[model samples]
Structures are given as structure tokens and as C-alpha cells.
Target chain A: VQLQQSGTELMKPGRSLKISCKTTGYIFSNYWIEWVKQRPGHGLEWIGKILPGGGSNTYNDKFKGKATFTADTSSNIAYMQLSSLTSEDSAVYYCARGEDYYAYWYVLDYWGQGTTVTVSSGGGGSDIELTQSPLSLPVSLGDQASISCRSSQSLVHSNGNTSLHWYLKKPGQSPKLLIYKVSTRFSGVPDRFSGSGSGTDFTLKISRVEAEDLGVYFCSQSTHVPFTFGSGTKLELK
Target chain B: VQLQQSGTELMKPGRSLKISCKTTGYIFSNYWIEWVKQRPGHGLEWIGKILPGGGSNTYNDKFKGKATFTADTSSNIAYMQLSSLTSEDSAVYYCARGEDYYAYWYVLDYWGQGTTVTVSSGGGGSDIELTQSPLSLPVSLGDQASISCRSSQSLVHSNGNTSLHWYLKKPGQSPKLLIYKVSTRFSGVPDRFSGSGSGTDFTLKISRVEAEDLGVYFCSQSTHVPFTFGSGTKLELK
Candidate 1:
């Protein structure tokens, strides 16, 4: 539930870039921060969602007129500007943490370790790697877990297909989608949760395991353009 | 892009219940038409949203004073009344189809196959079963997908925990959170998604199939004490 953010920006075309996100442990005004983007290569979007105690925001109409969203909550932070900038708005923004449960607001379970931006005119920036394997795994319930995902590059696609996929987050909540393509299963999933290999090597397996199945475990790729993930895998309880 | 809801009701507590949702092939005044609820077993609530072309509405402060939301746009429909009714407001309501994109409003992914409501007190009514497996699942992109959520009882929880979970709604936006108990993952999810098994079986793996991960896929449980869900799983795309 941390979130930090703010840094790495560049600006140019029409200029304007706000960025912020401070936050800490919880109750930043009863949740809702959102923001996300990711252009330089593309994939994640959603550019909207605020309400730090009532700053009230909620764009995404493709980012209606660009982007705005704001929030303060005394000082917990949570802003996002992005005015005219170009290069498709550069990319790599993120803020996350939105989960409201029951009354809805769902997903986005805590994040913020991103901010890049870079509209260029000489401001450069780039970074997108991924990795995951046995980082952790305990098992019990019925046993038979597995996890793997590798990618330094090559998410394959010229029609050969392969944008990898897989997710799971569980702790306070928010991240859900067990597999999206390297193997498939996304609707009430449950059949031992399996998945197979592909491009940079992949795997997910989960056969018997019960006890709520623990948490953590990701591996995204969204085929080319600019979508990358993978750096998780926890699953404890044994 | 479709919808159609309205039916099943039995009022009594204080009586009231508008409900409607008719819609078809987009352009129902651009978009926006939420209104969800579930009570009869719980989980899923968020009664608000409307804009059939300016009927204006946006509740969820715990459904403001019980819910109102209107919208006509000639005849595209999109209503919601519900006022006094009690028994915790007997559940099952749905109307979805929010989609706005850049100006923000993601996920609800075209729904409208729900209506049930019953406040009893002699008003008599009952219905709350669940089922869903291969209702559909085209697939293509990177291929390799799966779905399963068999449940008739025992979502496990004598402390042994097992609430199950998993959701998606991607047609126009408004139902996100890929996995919950049977495997965590839910905050900025994107790690090829993954979940495991438990009482009455479960799974939601998806290692590759991308296309924004098609749509529809639900499976809820919240561990005993009433909180069911499981009657989804669309995913199309071929």
C-alpha cells in the first residue's frame, strides 16, 4: 500500500506534465487513485480516477481532452496532469491503488513504481524487462503448484503470436486473471489452473492446491508494441 | 453492445422497483448505463450511473438514498428505481455497458441477463442457483485458454478459507479483478493471470490469449455466509 511515484518526465509538445502520487499504508482518503497509461510501447491504459477525499475525477473517455485527475487529502498526494504533450503522450505513468469492494470500484490493488513520460526533443528514457520463476512457493492443500516466466526480449508476434499472460495478486486484494494467452483460462477459472509453454518459456500449473491457493504470480506481455510485466510469484502456505 | 434486462421482482418492504435496460448495438447516447446489485447472497453492489443522453446520474455513496438513476434517450432505456424495499433488498439486478475509454469509464462489458428481486414478507419469491462452464470461449490471438468454476455448495471456509473469486467484464468496461481467493492477483494485474483450485473446483489460468482478453468471466464466493456468483464466462473472438 505504498505508491511513491513522481520523477522522470521530459515534456515538450504544448508542454504540461504534473505527476505525483505520494500515499502511504492505507486510508489515503478511503481509496481511489488510478491513472495508468504506458505508451512508449503500449498496452495498459485507463488514464483516469481520482477522489482523494473528494477531488472527484474519472476520465478515460480515451483520456478526454488529454488527462487531468487531481487529489490532495491534506498531503497524501495523488495528481496527474499531462496536458498537451505528444508522442502519444510518451507512456509509463501508473499510480494504482483503487479497490473499494462491495460498493464497487474494484481492482488496481496498490502500485506506483513508474512515471517515465518523455515527450522528447532530446529527453530520452526507456526500461521494460521481466522475470519470474521460483521466487517463492510453498504449497499444501493438495499440492502441485508451478510458476515460470522468462523474457529479456522476444515476445514474438509477426503473426507467430505470443504476448504472454498470467496474473494473480491477493494480499489486500486487486489483480485477478489467471492466464490470458500463453495458455488461457479467464472465466470462473478452476480445473487445477493449468497453462503451458511458449516464447520466452512459460508455465503456471496448480493442479490440487486448495486453501485459497495463496497469492502473487504474474507474467504479462501483451504481444509487441509496449506491454511488459513479470516480476512476481509468491504463493506461500505450506 | 446489447443489454435488454427487466423482469422478476416481488416487492413488499415498502415497494418500488423500476428496472429496465433495453439497449442494442451502441450509440445509446454514447454510453454509460451501470446499476448493479446482488444481495440475495451478497457480493456485487454499485447502484449508480446513467446518462442516456443526459438523464444524468452517478450514485454509489452506498447508493445515495437507495438508488434512482434514469435515462430514456427516446427509447434506448436504462432505468433503475428501487426505493424502500427491504430484506436487505433481495438481490440480482445488473444492467452494465459503460464503456467510454479515453475519458475513462472502463468495463461492464455488455451484460443484461439478470433481473431477479424479491423482498418477501409474504410477497413470496426465491431463486439463487449458479452455474457456468463453457457458455462460450472462441479464442485466437496467442491461443491456449480455459475456464471452469463448478459450484453447488462448499466454497470452503471453516477457517480453512476458500472464498473463490475472479471477474472480468471487458465489453465496454466495468467489472475487473481477475482472481481473488482461489489464487490472489488483483492490483494492476498482468502477469499472465493465474488462479488455482479448491472446494467445488476452480481455475482461471490464461497464459497468452490476448485481444484485450475478450470478455465475460465471473466466479465469486466470499467464503460461506451468503456471497455467491458464477454464471458468466463469455470470452469470444475466434
Candidate 2:
């Protein structure tokens, strides 16, 4: 039972504004958070991230205009703030936990609730209300299953650019890549699992899921940073 | 395009401090955020993380005594805080969306600016600040030079075999891995590039720092997200 970020916002016409988030119950600097944006009824957008120590940052070329990333490891917390915000920046924002594989660096595995922000020149507005919920998954045994995952709906893949992946795990073990570069399998992975979809709506499919795959299956991508993951889909065989 | 959390706290005698980070922008419920810790005079710590969209999480176990992770993509922010705030807890914390290649998620290519935290148990609580400047390097067109990288003092590699990789880039170029697996060079790398070290102390060495090595050097690990990089070290002619 983990937490996720969520919220809504409204800004008048033009003005710069910022929103914040606070966390409790864990040592934050120990991991990384990715900022993503979802335009009012659209898809997710990738911004960037902050390394735990200092000075280490990466940004998406598309977000350089409105996104910023930062952190405070001492109090075990981190943050992201948007600037020169405009109605165009109005969207649902999320902070996520990036899962790092020894071979890759920005694979997303965990996530947070979202906060919403809207910009308006009209100095009159309502507080952007934010809400969060733990990402939840319930699985039944031996059943074929699938999980949907993606970075930002706006993530663009040029020719030959490697993007999305799927992974599998057993309780008490590290996640192993099951599919990579979209639909290819990593070395030493089983062929029972497969991936499908393109752009934003991606999915990880499993045929005759086995008991060993009971833990949780994850989907991830590295096309950009503060890397991201899809809500995991667990497979439980009765 | 992204939103994060902030705040500071004091450590109780023999206790820890915890904080949370919320996010906004993008689809909070469809991605992951990673947590990282930067302690005084130490490298980054990949403590653990939560997948809010799927209810899955990974932990570095070594942080078992002092960390917890949670998230809520609904609000788009992930929450992580430390407990037993000892002087060791002093550092900046950050949360970023995790990134990966399709099958396995790892690495933190993109990131957030970090939040600073200070831990004091009374007697002049130690000041833990983030110094994100580039490490200075003296290099000769044909001389060897080296840079060190490591995870926070609290990483545990009991589950997956963890490893490190090093990269070098000329001014205004994308980074490329030169050394990987803690001492192995990636294919096509010049023999002049080498790596060594283990656990919390690792190094990337260039047999004869060439003119090409005079740009910036970065070290990354495939351990977990927030998959991180050391503050970059710049190699310049003396």
C-alpha cells in the first residue's frame, strides 16, 4: 500500500505560480522523484528530476520552458515547482519513485500523488486542491494478465530510439527485465511475457502466467528522465 | 510541468526524521517516483521506492532501520521520509519520476532540484548541505586522471548483483558510458578508460586523460532509482 500524487488547479490569465508537496514516513533523499504533467483531460508529460546529493539534474527538452526540479534530503523530502506558469501549464502533476536497475538508471517503479496548478493574470482564483491515494493491485493465481504502462502521452520515439520495457519479479528479489526496447526480451528472461502498444497506451501481456510470477510485474521507460513506470499489474496464480 | 515537496526537521536523540514529496503534472497514477538520499560527505543513497500506479515497491534493505516509502499518483506526488533522525540523516532529499527501457526500469536520467535538510540532536546539530558544483580535475592530453563515485553509505546489494558504470563527454555532447560493471569498459571505449572500487567507494580512471576526456565526467549506477549520477567532475588542462 503506497501513496501516489493527485490534484487539480485553475489560474486566471497570466502569472507565475508554484505549488509544493511534503512527505512523511521515509528517508527521501535515498531515492529519486520524477515530475510529470497531465493536461486537463489529456495524458502525462515528462519534466525532469534532481539527484540526491547535488548538482545532478536532467530535463526533457520539451519541458525546459516551464519545468524545474529540486530536492532537500536532510528532512528526508524533495520537491518540484513550476514557474512562469500559464493556462497551458495547467495540468495534474505527479512525483514518482524511479526504480534503478544496475544496467539502467531512470527506470520508474514507484509513484506519488499529483498536485494541480493553473495560472491566470486575473489575481482571483481558488486554491488548487490536491489529493493522493496508494497505488493498489490485486491479483488472482495462474491467470493470464497484463499491465498498462507509459511515460508521458507526449513521449515521442524517433527512429531506432529505445523506449519502454516490462519486468518480472518473485517475492524478495530484484525485478528482472522481461521485455525491452518495447517488445524485445532481456537476456535470460522467459518468452511467456510480451509487450504491446505504442505512444501512450502501452501494455505488458503474459500468457499462462505462472506462480513464480506472482509478485508483481512492472513496466518502465528511459527515453527521458526522472524516469517513469506504469502502475504495476500483479499476477497471482491460485 | 512538475511539482515536488519541501520542509525541514530536527532529529530527536537516537531518532530519525521523515518527510514527503507530492507531485503534479502528467498522469500521477501512471508512473513511478524514486527516492534518493545524500548524506554529509557521502555519495547518493538509493534507499527504496513505491510504485503508486501498481502498488509495488523496491527497497535497499540497508535502510531498513530508517526508511519507509509511499505514494499517491492521484495527487501526482510520492512521499518518503526517514526515521531516527541522527546526525547521519542530515542531507538533501529529492524525488523524481523513474525511467527505464520498456522491460526493466532503472536509471535516473531526468531529475528534480533537491531540498536541503539539516539534522541536529542538540549540540550544534551538524549542518548537511548539498554542494552540487563540478569536481575539479587537472588533466593533460595524454595523462591519466580518475574520479570517484558511490552510493550512499547505506546501500545493500543482497538481492541483485549491483554494479557501476562511468561515462565521459566532450563539451556540449551527450554522455556516453566508458566503463561499466565496476571496472569493465563498454565496447568501443578506449583502453585509456578504466574503473575500480566497490561498495560505497568506486572510481573511474582514465589511463591517459586525452583531449576528449577534458570535458565532463559522470558516474552512474544501475542499482535503483533514483538511479543517480555523481556531481560531475570537469577535466581541464592544468
Candidate 3:
């Protein structure tokens, strides 16, 4: 007897997926066909078992609502449908035969090579985290205040350029670029405010913290594939 | 850019699970990392927003008590811990550049491969019904008695061999084979006992029942993979 299964697939979450197993050499309705979950580096998990259109089917409590099993006696094929996908559903699924359930006769013996279904968001590359020091800083008029931004990795690109930059956001308004590449001042940025850093360590300093700079200051890096930015420092009256 | 995650997990209910996303190819602590949920068939739901080790986190109102977020800035890893999980919590989770919580609006730009976590109880399958007529039968000594056995499917195999059989059991001792393959009596059986069957219908007959025959008789069929037995008939000294 042979169980032939569907091929591998790359899935984006929220998309539905269906995989199948077709068999020959045995009476399809006579034996119990089961679905097993064998994800990467994981053991086997019983998904469900069913008799071809016979209504003799059982599913694990955990899979009762998560899995749907059906079969075609005429085609000797079994199918499982998964909906509303997510990365957690990424795994290799297999189909096998068991003569009877809850007995030695039910032990799965023959298994299909299995179909692999991988799930992911596919929005972008690896996730990145931005750390900004002094979540909240109390600054006085004309006071020199500084905020530090530390990166988990160096933000220096192979082209000998540091991608570290700075931005300032006023309350209820959009953020504006202050500096780029560590110390390059933006067109509208004043001389009193400066950005400086190297590799993974960076800083945003305002020489005379004026009322305009009393909102929020942020640091960012573009050395990586997905540009990243710091959480930000809320600067307000002391 | 990469957001490598831990392997899949099979956990029991009422237990806690913690899965991590170790990221690289970007500044780990220079971006807002957000967690997103894509439940089976459902769209995206925001779970949390984290600022690595600098501590800028805001969670969904629903996930406030169900999930906890943490990160090891030194290790470039972000973690999400789920508690008191149920089948409802079974879904795909993704970590993305949580978004830059800017003065304007936040948005996701990148993501990681998901890790699946399943918490389910085991066992369920197709339903099979075995019916035997005359829940109980009363018979007298020296009298002729018969019992009917009906199956949902044919007891005759494609090879033309009937797997129908019969057995007799006294009150205490083990059951003994009486008739097999329709009329093949056992080594020590008397000629009075006989069995007959075809397709889904079956019968067991006794001629001139003796006082020693005061016991229960059972009919069974092995034609199907999961063999089944009939309820039985009793013979007593009338």
C-alpha cells in the first residue's frame, strides 16, 4: 500500500491551506486513515482519524476546532483543511494507516512522506527592537539635555558610513529629521542640536533645550535591511 | 534580516509557554518590535509593543493578563509568554518591527518566522455500531434454539470466505469455540451446534440443547479489520 501526499508550500498568515494524501493497494474505507503533525524538530501529534465518508472519525480535543478531515472513498484520498493561518501552524503533516483505534490494530504503520506547510507574516525581514534611554526627560528652558540610543548591533554599513540619525517630534505634530549619519545636520535643524555616535552606540544632544525641543527626541539607524528607530525620549517641563 | 524562532511546542492546558524570537541583520535595540496574532481564518490582531531593554511596552487590552513580554537586549532576543492557554489561543504569532511609535502613526514593516504552540487532549475517530438481536434469549433443555447476528457490513470477504464464527461460555470458565466459518465445529464440539452467515446477515443454531449446554452463546465476525461480537443468548434448564 502506498500513501502519496501533496508537496510543500510557503504560506502567509490569514490564508487558508489544504493538503491531501491518496492511497492504493488497500480498501480505503476498510482501514482508518489518520493525520499526524510532525513539525520541524518535533515529535508526532495525532491530528485526527476518519473512515471514508463513514462518519467514524475522531479528533484530538485540541484539534477538534482547529482541524477538518474528510475523505473520498471513490478516489482513495484523504484531506485536511486549515484556515486563518499563522506561523504557529507551520509544520510537516503526514497521513498514515491504522486498522483499528484504541487497540494494537490501530497502531500506525504506513505513512506518507508528508506535506510541509510553512506559515509566516512575510511583511519584512527579522524583527528589530529600538532602545531609547530616559523614557521621559524633564528639561528647563535653555538647558542642555541629552538622550542616548543603544543598538543591539553595530549600525555601521560596509561602505564606511554610520546610519545613526536623529528626529524631533512636537506634541500633536509629525516628527522632523534633525541629523543623519551620526553628525550630518538636517536642513531645518538648528546649530544648538546635534547627533553623534559610532557603531552601535549613539546620542542626541540639544545644547540649549528650547520649548520647540521640549516634545520628544528619537534616534534611528538605516544600516540594516529594515530601517529601525529608537523608542523615543519625552522631553517636557521639569 | 532574520527573526529566528524556537521550534514548535506541544503543551497541556493550564500550563505556560514561552517562545522566543532571536533576530539579526538589524539593530535589535533600535526599533519598535511588535507582536501580532493571526488566528486560524482570522485577520491580524495586535498583541503587544516592546522597546527591547529600554522598556517601552503597551499590550492589547485582551492580552494584558494572558501574555507577558520580555527581551534580553544583551542577547538580541525577544520573548512572549502565554499563560492558561486553551484551544482558543491556538494561532500563529509573529514578531515585527513593532513599528516606530512616532508622533503620527505606527506601522509594521518586518517580521519573523512563527512558532506554533498546541495544547490539546487526545483521541477521537469514526463511530461504528454493532447490533445483536434478542438482548437476551431463554431456552429450555432438549429444545431447539437460535440467535441472529446482523452487521453493518458484509461478513463475506472478496475471496469468498465467510469470517463468521460462534462460541459458548459457561458461568465461570473461559469461552470455548463452538462453530467457525459458518459450520466448521471445533475439535470437541457436538454435531448439534451449527453456525451460518452470508453478507451482513448471520445465525447460530442449537439442536436438542442439553442441560450441560446451560450457558451463553456468542457470534462474532472477523471479516472486518476491527472484529465485533454479538450480545449473546442464554440456555438454561427449563
Candidate 4:
């Protein structure tokens, strides 16, 4: 897994930064590399992706003003650069591979390392760096927090995409489900956790960010292989 | 964008290796994350993954002996570790996030940095100290090499299974197809490149590598998050 990402860029609201991953080893022209977004204290946002052979691109509607995907099949490499970045867009960006057109749509099976960027007011405020940890913050009894989770890319299959699901864990407790398939809330999930997305993009939104959300929130796919994961984004209070 | 991982070990031959990714800021559990692997000349391998909230895991049967997926919802963290590390297991592992599975299985939207591990004699291969770039070797054409491409987890969409593809490149040339969608053939793909697997776990394999196969080998998923390719394996001549 050799993921070489572009340097981080500091930008103000409305500015943009582009990151790329150049891969060698196998033919990259035939495969696809997708992109994902992680905002401060928020869940992942499926931005879009570029296909090598077809030179096709797709984006998540929610990321309307934020992300984009493009490819240069000639380089056996693909790039995902954020455009019009803002303090709200301050988050790590990633490039991954998976099939999006299948029946299931946006399930990611493999992924790249991530690239972090800081979005500031440009008011002499240095970039806001993010910290990741096992338990970023202590779980409070009623404090609201959001735990985010995601996969590198969608897993590919012939029949189509399998279903995607999400879960939650109260500190020291077993994991529970918050969302499933993308937007459908599980039977017992609190209103805090919600899922949404179409095609290659999906999200499990925890509206209030609860103390229980402090535990890790992970997103996974039934894609095969080196079945994988995102490095994991920690959630804590400001 | 960048996923830094926690390390772990396997107690028994078939026991799983569990590592963790603690994330901060942005909802970490709302999206998808994936795992990938790179071998000698092989590009990457997609293993399997789990949803932090759903408490569900998807995997490639082939990787059943080598990997596992789990998450700590309380910590906003996710984990993936190889079960049986062999000489082949010596590679850099990465985690990533993607869109929802309801859309496509192969779409890999986001990514993590990566962790390196060497499955030494204690696991299988004898008294051998292995070292290389990214915990794996940089392959050069005209060298004896093999490559593997995989996904993070199963894209268990109702469609069926995700498709895996493999590719290769020669020096100063563009990438070409070696395999496609887990065994499907591309227009001019050679027989040397092959792929096999189901769900999110998939593998692209190259045998008796030739100079032409020296450039790089990458595995791609058509399941969903837009898609991603491994960092790449460079094959060099001895």
C-alpha cells in the first residue's frame, strides 16, 4: 500500500487545494480511485471519483461546493483535489478504489492513506491541525458528540454492490447500529445518528454529537479483499 | 485524508492481527474505510472490513486465513490486522473511507496513511530480516516478482460480489490491463495477470513476471466510492 499524497495546503474559505496519488506496480488505467472528505467534528462526505479508462467522474451532492475527482490514465495515476476550500472544508482527503456503478453503488473495499489540510480564517490563524487518538475524549453521560466512520473505497463484485451498514459503541459497551445502507436509521438508533447518500457517496450523520458518539464510529463495506478501513477520525468536544 | 494506524500482533498461526485507527474531528464512523496490501511486484490486496456502527464485517474468502476487521465505537476508532503474516505478508497496510454500500461496492472514496509490518519466521519464513520501502519491496521489471490487489471489506450489496482488476506497466509507458473484475479479461490483457475473489476482498496475481510486467501492478474495485488504486509496486531488474 504505497499511498503518496500531495502536500497539505492552507486555505481560506472559497480557496481550493488539490492532492494526488501516483501509483505504480500494476496498470492503473483500468481501475478507479475514489475520493472522500472528513470535516471537523463531522462524519465523512463522499466527494467524487475519476475512472482511468473511461475518464469518468462522480460526486456526492452534499459536497456540492467542496470536492471533485479527476484522472490522468496516461500517468497510471489519479488525483483528488479539493476546490473552493473553506474552514468548513478543513478535513483530510483520501483517494481509494472500488466499483460504484454496481447495484450497491458506493461501497469501498480498498483505500489510500489520507492527506490532511487545515482551513483557517486567513486572519493570521495558523492551519487547524487535527488530532487522532484511541479515545479522543471522555464519554459524558449526556453531552452530544458525533463519531465518524468510513471505508477507503467500495468493494467490487460481479452481481452488483452488497449492502453497506454502520454501527455505534457506548463507552465500555457493545457496538450498536446507527445507520444502514446509507440513510436508513436502524430501529433503536437515537435521532442523533443518521445515514445518507446515493451512488458512490454515503454519510452517517450524528446531528448532536453525543457522548456515546465519543467512542469510535466506523464505516465499512461488504466488499472483499484486503477488506479495509479508514485510519479513523476521533471525535471530542472543543 | 491521512490515516495513521496502531500496531498489533497475532498469537496463533490463524489468529487475526488487530490494529486500530483513532480519528479526530469530523464524524469518523459515518462513512466507509478499507484495507489494502502490496507485495513484491504485486500492487495491492483488498482484504475485508467492518462498519463501526453496524457491527458488520465483510471479507474475501481468500483472505480468511490472513485478516480480520473490528472497531472500537467508543474511541472513534477502527482496526484491521493480518492474521497470518508470511513473507507475502510483508507490506504496508492502509485504511480508507468510502461512500455508502447501497450505491456501489468498488467505490473507494477516502484513505489513510499506512502501517508497515513484517510477518517473519515466528509466523512462517525462517531467520530472515526483511527490509524495503514501505515495509515491502520496490519491484523493477525483469525481476522475479508477484503482485496482489485487494479491497477493504465485502461490498455485500444484493447484487452479488465486487469485481477485481489488475494491471501492469513497463518503463516509459502507460499502464495496461493484466486482469479485470476478479478474473474478467480486458481487451488485450495478458494471461500472466489474474484476479480472484468475492465481496470486498479481492486479489490480483502475477506469475513468472516478465520485464514487461516490471513497472507496476494495481488492483481496482468496481464496487463503488468512486474507486482507488494501491500506491503501486515497482518491479526492477536485479
Top-TM-score structure, candidate number: 3
Cα displacement (Å) at residue B151, model 2: 3.3
Looking at candidate 1 chain A, the ten consecutive residues that score lowest on lDDT are: A120-129
RMSD of each: 28.0, 25.7, 22.4, 23.5
Best by DockQ: 4
Sort the candidates on lDDT, descending order. 3, 1, 2, 4
| Least well predicted 10-residue stretch by lDDT in candidate 2 chain B | B123-132
Fnat: each model in turn: 0.01, 0.02, 0.05, 0.07
Residue-level lDDT tens digits of model 3 in A1-238: 7889898888755466778899898878878887767554333456767878676876656665457788988899998877655555677887877545333233345667778887765433453455788888997898988889888888767767777767665533334567777888867678998878887778888899777677777776656644555666888889
Q: Per-prediction DockQ, in order?
A: 0.02, 0.02, 0.03, 0.05
lDDT per residue as tens, model 4, B114-224 = 566654423211211111122134544434445544445553334665545554534332245566546666656576666676665555555556655555455544454
iRMSD, model 2, in Å = 24.7
TM-score of chain A of each: 0.27, 0.43, 0.53, 0.46
Whole-model alpha-carbon lDDT for candidate 2: 0.55
> Residue A118 error for model 3, in Å?
2.7
Residue A171 in model 1: lDDT: 45
Give the DockQ-based CAPRI class for model 2.
incorrect
